[PDB]
Ligand binder design. Structure first.
Ligand SMILES: CCCCCCCC(=O)OC[C@H](COP(=O)(O)O[C@@H]1[C@H](O)[C@H](O)[C@@H](OP(=O)(O)O)[C@H](OP(=O)(O)O)[C@H]1O)OC(=O)CCCCCCC
Ligand SMILES: CCCCCCCC(=O)OC[C@H](COP(=O)(O)O[C@@H]1[C@H](O)[C@H](O)[C@@H](OP(=O)(O)O)[C@H](OP(=O)(O)O)[C@H]1O)OC(=O)CCCCCCC
Ligand SMILES: CCCCCCCC(=O)OC[C@H](COP(=O)(O)O[C@@H]1[C@H](O)[C@H](O)[C@@H](O)[C@H](O)[C@H]1O)OC(=O)CCCCCCC
Ligand SMILES: CC(C)CCC[C@@H](C)[C@H]1CC[C@H]2[C@@H]3CC=C4C[C@@H](O)CC[C@]4(C)[C@H]3CC[C@]12C
Ligand SMILES: CC(C)CCC[C@@H](C)[C@H]1CC[C@H]2[C@@H]3CC=C4C[C@@H](O)CC[C@]4(C)[C@H]3CC[C@]12C
Ligand SMILES: CC(C)CCC[C@@H](C)[C@H]1CC[C@H]2[C@@H]3CC=C4C[C@@H](O)CC[C@]4(C)[C@H]3CC[C@]12C
Ligand SMILES: CC(C)CCC[C@@H](C)[C@H]1CC[C@H]2[C@@H]3CC=C4C[C@@H](O)CC[C@]4(C)[C@H]3CC[C@]12C
Ligand SMILES: CC(C)CCC[C@@H](C)[C@H]1CC[C@H]2[C@@H]3CC=C4C[C@@H](O)CC[C@]4(C)[C@H]3CC[C@]12C
Ligand SMILES: CC(C)CCC[C@@H](C)[C@H]1CC[C@H]2[C@@H]3CC=C4C[C@@H](O)CC[C@]4(C)[C@H]3CC[C@]12C
Ligand SMILES: CC(C)CCC[C@@H](C)[C@H]1CC[C@H]2[C@@H]3CC=C4C[C@@H](O)CC[C@]4(C)[C@H]3CC[C@]12C
Ligand SMILES: CC(C)CCC[C@@H](C)[C@H]1CC[C@H]2[C@@H]3CC=C4C[C@@H](O)CC[C@]4(C)[C@H]3CC[C@]12C
Ligand SMILES: CC(C)CCC[C@@H](C)[C@H]1CC[C@H]2[C@@H]3CC=C4C[C@@H](O)CC[C@]4(C)[C@H]3CC[C@]12C
Ligand SMILES: CC(C)CCC[C@@H](C)[C@H]1CC[C@H]2[C@@H]3CC=C4C[C@@H](O)CC[C@]4(C)[C@H]3CC[C@]12C
Ligand SMILES: CC(C)CCC[C@@H](C)[C@H]1CC[C@H]2[C@@H]3CC=C4C[C@@H](O)CC[C@]4(C)[C@H]3CC[C@]12C
Ligand SMILES: CC(C)CCC[C@@H](C)[C@H]1CC[C@H]2[C@@H]3CC=C4C[C@@H](O)CC[C@]4(C)[C@H]3CC[C@]12C
Ligand SMILES: CC(C)CCC[C@@H](C)[C@H]1CC[C@H]2[C@@H]3CC=C4C[C@@H](O)CC[C@]4(C)[C@H]3CC[C@]12C
Ligand SMILES: CC(C)CCC[C@@H](C)[C@H]1CC[C@H]2[C@@H]3CC=C4C[C@@H](O)CC[C@]4(C)[C@H]3CC[C@]12C
Ligand SMILES: CC(C)CCC[C@@H](C)[C@H]1CC[C@H]2[C@@H]3CC=C4C[C@@H](O)CC[C@]4(C)[C@H]3CC[C@]12C
Ligand SMILES: CC(C)CCC[C@@H](C)[C@H]1CC[C@H]2[C@@H]3CC=C4C[C@@H](O)CC[C@]4(C)[C@H]3CC[C@]12C
Ligand SMILES: CNCC[C@H](Oc1ccccc1OC)c1ccccc1
Ligand SMILES: CNCC[C@H](Oc1ccccc1OC)c1ccccc1
Ligand SMILES: [Cl-]
Ligand SMILES: [Cl-]
Ligand code: NA
Ligand code: NA
Ligand code: NA
Ligand code: NA
Lengths: 565, 565
């Protein structure tokens, strides 16, 4: 029974949680969601939502970890009925990791496509990009007017290299005929998973330095990019369009849901990564300051990434003689299409391409590292046999992720990636964070967690924190869940409609998770010896307090536990 | 540490080894291989080969089990360097099981297609069979002459129901585009794996009664079939063609290899099933009588199945006014095409169809049961944690087999089935039995095994048995391996050529096995503490004798061990 591991320094934990919080969603989703939702008028609700969805929950997780010093699965020693919930989130993270690795591979491919004087996305002619031959001309070299949407036009050299050069989507038609995995993407995925294994194979020692590097790099990259972009012609128009405050859209009821989803999927609240990272800190560490600093750093990073991206977009629109809304897009398509074009247009395309691709690689690597570390920590604290042998279990996890990401990098693997991401991430992690909030706030109690924090840190959390823990956060999570359930639309690509069975498979994965949580609750209720009341007491009370279950002193049965605010 | 399990009676073990020995290869491959290779002139070498490939090896396995009372993996306590060999065979069996389950499902489908007054294979018109519409007429109702081969003609109602009604091969083009698994085949596979799990979930208690039933049924089915067939017109010509002795072909050098492969793949010598079944017998049980009776029963069953099948073929050729060689075929296509046609032609098609399909179902079930029981016994004797919890491990094995058989029952799953069967079975099990023979006969010794048998049974094996164990069987296995390696041809279906990468994947699986055996030998050589000679001694000597490794008394180092015959 070796003692629990600890970080070398708290700066390592801070950089780890920052790298987990900072993601490509801050780069490709926050700017577009901000500009589309009235610019600055998007921020006024966003930060507000951010505040709640950032301050208690994150804090809670950290505090929870600092009080439990265990993984996301075994953290439910105060309420075993929700322990399976942790299991779910682990699988959830695992699921995410799969397609996330795919994204990383893409960046790595572009990295291997960045060492040349004539980049593939510059011109046409089978220059490392499969020529569709259906008018693969220069982007807008001949004519002045871009009639259709720039992102919708699929005959630009950047888009041709994206969907044909690396993805090879032309060789597939959908999820019914996906084909075989590509070999160069296979090698890129091999390199990615090998780096991840060599980073996470030995506790939290080397991973600290790795997240140090992958945190120090992207901020410098963004700084250099914005410094070079503010001097570019036309970037001022893009920046002004990004910060244009139009308070009219706030009542549209769509600027709130988008901001809530963006904050929830960017900050990482409710995920096992936070508990896993907090399970290695000191017992007297201040989780409040750490959570606040992480949220502030995440928001500032999102804002500066939006500034830089929209400066680049304004420069490109000036070069393309079009409006900012035409070039405005979001996602992997957005980056991999528009950024290489502006880089090739700028002087020294090699340096900018290399630095942008290495920033994306570092971000993806640190995010997948945090997710896989959470998975490993949870499954190790759950089964002590896995905690002893960490290298072999890490190798097995990396190999399973590699096999499933190979399944997902096929000719039609973008459809499987979208399906997994949308269905699994949204539904599963929403239900998981809702169950976790309900368990920690109501079933366990909001005063016991405050007393635990008072034991860890000298000051006791105020009334606002408890009220947001018990009422505001659960209601917000339930609202987001109901919105995601009602607003569900059939899966659709750019121009490809998904057959009905793909949506049913996605909902089947989501239902697998949200019955495995009840499957575990039923297993716990049945595997206990006693009557209805005694089984319920053993299920809703902490294990270390199970003795008072026999003493007829259950606090949850009384009503003072429920109304403790 | 619960004691080792034992059979309720030795009749259970006998029926189990008979059911494992009796397979559909005796039904669809032995008759065609016999008739094609000069009829009775096929038997003269066959039985001879049979004798060797049946008498010592089988016996050896049984005796080995009776001396070890463990699985196929852990049976190498006398030579740990070959223990990984056992691992291989386990995986090999597992591999086989996958596609084997597919075959079982097929029969089950035909079973669910046997309860009707107008059977699907009788007539055309979308009668439970997908009509290709390219002249799907009556078989030979209009015309008298069958120009092309009857089995090659793909527009007969039986063939239309086979390749389109259940397999749905028209909806696929090869292994590159396989598609999604079919739902009715999915349900049939579910039923099959559920029956297998309910049979093998509790030791060797219920499996005894299950193999009792699945042994008592097929012999009665074959008896009724032959009794009804000897009275049919034209069956005498088919029987005479089957038993026509033409000693001219014996020098063609092809009637020997086919007989050797048929015996080796029908008797099951070198597989883990024999060791697993012998690991539950009494220490004083006679393995010689059991092996001899099993070989004789297998040969007689093959002969009577050939008699009945060729009587049916002669009757059908009389009904079709063609020669016996035209209707003569082999395999799942042979049975599922020709037998339903003759059954529909006969009176009371329902009874004959039901009894034939239930015989095929029983055979497939008992064979897959033996294979999965071998796998479970090996992996349980290897890891004691799995021997304790047998139900959960059996469920996991059945679920993995179910998932891979679902992968193999897709629209193009027949190609994957052929690939797996040919490559995996042939190459892997040939290398495995060669390594096992070399280990038990040369590295361990042929006199020590004889002394072990003398300890188990009063009489000591004669000189012929030891000479066949040490020289004849290893040379025969090496000959078969060399023939299989040299005569390797690219994978080809009826009319579909396989792309090169399918053959490379098959050879990659075979190489995975035949390096995992050296991978284990290298792991054993490296994980030992000592110099070259001490490591080699600890690797080539029994564990219970490892003490004399320190006493410098290794017998294998001397030459008297090698020439002990
Ligand atoms: C289906 C299978 C397909 C692929 C099969 C792949 C086979 C497989 O399982 O490998 C995964 C991984 C191997 O790791 P790896 O390939 O990197 O091999 C070395 C080994 O792990 C050493 O222990 C390391 O020394 P140390 O730790 O720094 O002192 C050395 O690191 P370094 O010095 O060069 O930097 C490593 O190079 O697992 C284990 O660790 C086994 C040892 C168990 C515990 C190790 C004892 C610490
Ligand atoms: C990914 C998962 C997807 C599917 C998950 C599928 C769920 C799963 O995990 O299955 C595993 C396996 C399935 O078998 P099954 O569920 O049928 O077993 C049940 C029960 O657990 C008893 O083991 C059975 O024997 P008994 O009659 O009571 O004696 C009883 O049989 P019966 O009542 O029908 O006759 C059954 O009710 O369950 C175990 O056996 C655990 C060992 C417990 C040992 C208890 C006895 C030794
Ligand atoms: C990466 C996959 C993520 C999920 C991992 C779950 C593994 C698991 O096994 O869960 C079993 C659980 C009850 O069994 P356990 O909870 O594990 O038993 C516990 C144990 O023995 C621990 O060692 C001790 O500390 C706990 O006290 C036991 O309860 O049943 C369930 O909810 C269905 C979950 C099955 C998951 C299958 C995936 C579809
Ligand atoms: C239990 C967990 C860890 C196993 C992994 C589940 C995931 C990775 C598996 C389960 C079901 C699988 C999907 C089932 C449906 C299809 C159809 C095929 O045409 C495209 C691949 C695709 C989309 C599969 C991709 C991988 C998949 C989503
Ligand atoms: C020009 C392109 C490649 C960007 C270069 C980024 C790399 C080279 C820079 C960016 C930020 C840098 C980090 C920022 C500051 C520190 C803190 C110091 O205590 C250790 C080194 C470390 C961690 C630096 C390492 C090198 C670093 C990661
Ligand atoms: C690197 C330059 C060009 C861009 C500026 C990026 C800023 C926001 C980032 C990048 C590197 C980061 C520094 C690297 C690591 C350390 C050491 C430790 O004590 C924490 C603060 C400090 C000093 C970080 C502060 C924030 C930091 C300076
Ligand atoms: C939204 C973009 C601009 C980044 C967000 C920056 C703003 C919104 C963030 C950064 C620093 C944050 C503050 C940090 C400190 C505190 C004190 C705490 O007791 C309540 C929350 C509060 C008041 C935070 C509110 C939100 C905050 C002001
Ligand atoms: C492709 C994937 C599935 C690889 C398989 C995962 C393997 C490598 C992982 C998963 C679980 C791990 C095991 C969990 C615990 C133990 C018990 C210990 O006494 C021996 C090591 C062993 C057995 C670990 C070895 C490695 C292991 C088997
Ligand atoms: C490896 C990837 C796919 C995720 C891991 C899958 C999980 C659910 C499975 C796969 C292998 C399993 C482990 C294999 C080995 C052991 C040792 C045993 O004494 C306790 C259970 C335990 C610890 C299992 C727990 C659950 C386990 C970790
Ligand atoms: C571990 C995860 C992958 C569990 C996966 C369960 C999913 C992949 C499986 C289980 C049951 C399956 C469903 C059962 C039957 C139908 C009806 C038909 O309309 C096809 C889709 C649909 C709805 C299947 C889709 C795939 C499905 C939902
Ligand atoms: C409690 C746990 C087990 C699961 C609870 C989640 C519930 C709310 C899930 C389970 C099944 C899900 C449904 C499955 C599929 C569909 C059909 C689709 O056209 C609209 C969404 C809808 C209707 C989903 C809505 C959300 C849903 C009803
Ligand atoms: C290690 C063991 C247990 C894993 C199982 C191996 C088998 C079942 C797997 C591994 C490699 C797989 C094959 C390799 C790729 C293809 C090509 C595709 O067009 C059809 C499926 C097919 C033919 C796969 C079928 C299933 C397969 C043969
Ligand atoms: C369905 C039809 C066609 C097949 C009939 C099944 C017959 C052949 C099989 C099934 C079960 C078998 C019986 C199972 C058990 C016993 C008890 C034993 O003391 C004598 C043999 C006897 C009686 C077996 C004889 C053969 C048997 C009756
Ligand atoms: C099923 C019958 C009528 C058709 C002919 C098949 C015969 C030869 C098969 C089928 C069932 C078999 C019998 C069923 C089981 C037993 C009980 C055992 O203690 C002695 C062998 C004996 C008696 C078997 C002998 C061979 C057997 C009789
Ligand atoms: C008809 C064919 C297909 C089946 C083969 C049956 C014959 C060839 C087999 C079955 C039973 C066998 C015999 C069974 C018992 C013995 C021991 C002794 O007496 C000499 C050889 C001898 C070892 C075997 C010779 C070969 C044998 C006669
Ligand atoms: C491969 C997939 C599809 C099937 C699932 C495999 C499962 C069912 C099998 C494989 C290995 C088995 C485990 C190995 C040994 C142990 C240790 C014990 O303390 C709990 C039971 C447990 C954990 C077994 C439970 C069932 C188990 C996990
Ligand atoms: C489930 C089927 C496919 C078996 C094939 C996979 C085999 C090789 C794997 C899967 C699950 C694994 C087992 C999972 C659990 C344990 C418990 C641990 O303390 C010893 C190793 C042991 C026993 C593993 C041994 C190897 C194992 C059985
Ligand atoms: C199935 C498991 C047990 C192991 C299987 C290994 C197989 C599936 C893998 C491993 C390495 C792979 C090979 C690697 C190299 C090439 C190059 C290409 O020009 C033909 C395909 C081919 C030959 C691949 C075919 C599939 C392959 C052989
Ligand atoms: C000892 C273990 C590791 C494996 C034994 C090596 C032998 C038996 C294996 C390893 C590589 C295999 C070869 C791989 C693929 C080919 C090319 C094909 O066109 C003919 C068969 C042939 C030539 C295979 C023959 C069998 C083979 C030579
Ligand atoms: C929140 N910033 C990291 C984003 C988070 O990263 C993960 C990456 C890999 C594995 C697990 C991850 O988390 C569980 C995520 C979650 C859901 C969808 C996409 C991305
Ligand atoms: C020998 N009479 C049984 C045949 C044998 O049956 C098995 C079936 C399922 C799993 C394992 C099997 O054995 C390992 C086999 C072996 C190789 C290829 C096909 C068939
Ligand atoms: Cl953000
Ligand atoms: Cl035979
Ligand atoms: Na983020
Ligand atoms: Na990141
Ligand atoms: Na046989
Ligand atoms: Na059989």
């Amino acid at each position: 029974a070796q003692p629990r591991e600890t970080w070398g320094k708290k700066i390592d934990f801070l950089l780890s949680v920052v790298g987990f919080a900072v993601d490509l969603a801050n780069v490709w989703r926050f700017p577009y969601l901000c500009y589309k939702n009235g610019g600055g008028a998007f921020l006024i609700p966003y930060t507000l939502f951010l505040i709640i969805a950032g301050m208690p929950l994150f804090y809670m997780e950290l505090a929870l970890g600092q009080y439990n010093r265990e993984g996301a699965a075994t953290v439910w020693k105060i309420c075993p009925f929700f322990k399976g919930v942790g299991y779910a989130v682990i699988l959830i993270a695992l699921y995410v990791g799969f397609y996330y690795n795919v994204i990383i591979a893409w960046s790595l491919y572009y990295l291997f496509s960045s060492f040349t004087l004539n980049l593939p996305w510059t011109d046409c002619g089978h220059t490392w990009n499969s020529p569709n031959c259906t008018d693969p001309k220069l982007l807008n070299g001949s004519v002045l007017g871009n009639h259709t949407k720039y992102s919708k036009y699929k005959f630009t050299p950047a888009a041709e290299f994206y969907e044909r050069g690396v993805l090879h989507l032309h060789e597939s038609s959908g999820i019914h005929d996906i084909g075989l995995p590509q070999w160069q993407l296979l090698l890129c995925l091999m390199v990615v998973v090998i780096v991840l294994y060599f980073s996470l194979w030995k506790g939290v020692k080397t991973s600290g330095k790795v997240v140090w590097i992958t945190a120090t790099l992207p901020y410098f990259v963004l700084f250099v990019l914005l410094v070079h972009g503010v001097t570019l012609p036309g970037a001022s128009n893009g920046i002004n369009a990004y910060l244009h405050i139009d308070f009219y859209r706030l009542k549209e009821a769509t600027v709130w849901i988008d901001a809530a989803t963006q904050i929830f999927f960017s900050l990482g609240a409710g995920f096992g990564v936070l508990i896993a990272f907090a399970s290695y800190n000191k017992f007297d560490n201040n989780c409040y300051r750490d959570a606040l600093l992480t949220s502030s750093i995440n928001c500032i990073t999102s804002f500066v990434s939006g500034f830089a991206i929209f400066s680049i977009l304004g420069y490109m629109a000036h070069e393309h003689k079009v409006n900012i809304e035409d070039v405005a897009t979001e996602g992997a398509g957005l980056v991999f299409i528009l950024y290489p074009e502006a880089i090739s247009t700028l002087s020294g395309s090699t340096f900018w391409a290399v630095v942008f691709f290495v920033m994306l690689l570092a971000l993806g690597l640190d995010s997948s590292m945090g997710g896989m570390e959470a998975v490993i920590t949870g499954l190790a604290d759950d089964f002590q046999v896995l905690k002893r042998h960490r290298k072999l279990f890490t190798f097995g996890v990396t190999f399973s992720t590699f096999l499933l990401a190979l399944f997902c990098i096929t000719k039609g693997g973008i459809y499987v990636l979208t399906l997994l991401d949308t269905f699994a991430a949204g539904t599963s992690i929403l239900f998981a964070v809702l169950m976790e909030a309900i368990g920690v706030s109501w079933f366990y109690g909001v005063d016991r967690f405050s007393n635990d924090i008072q034991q860890m840190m000298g000051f006791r959390p105020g009334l606002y924190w408890r009220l947001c823990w018990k009422f505001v956060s659960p209601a917000f999570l339930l609202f987001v869940v109901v919105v995601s359930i009602i607003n569900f639309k059939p899966l659709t690509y750019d121009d490809y409609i998904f057959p009905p069975w793909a949506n049913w498979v996605g909902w089947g994965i989501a239902l697998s998770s949200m019955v495995l949580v009840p499957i575990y609750v039923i297993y716990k209720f049945l595997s206990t010896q006693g009557s209805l009341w005694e089984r319920l007491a053993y299920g809703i009370t902490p294990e270390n307090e199970h003795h008072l279950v026999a003493q007829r002193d259950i606090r949850q049965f009384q009503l003072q536990h429920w109304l403790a605010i």
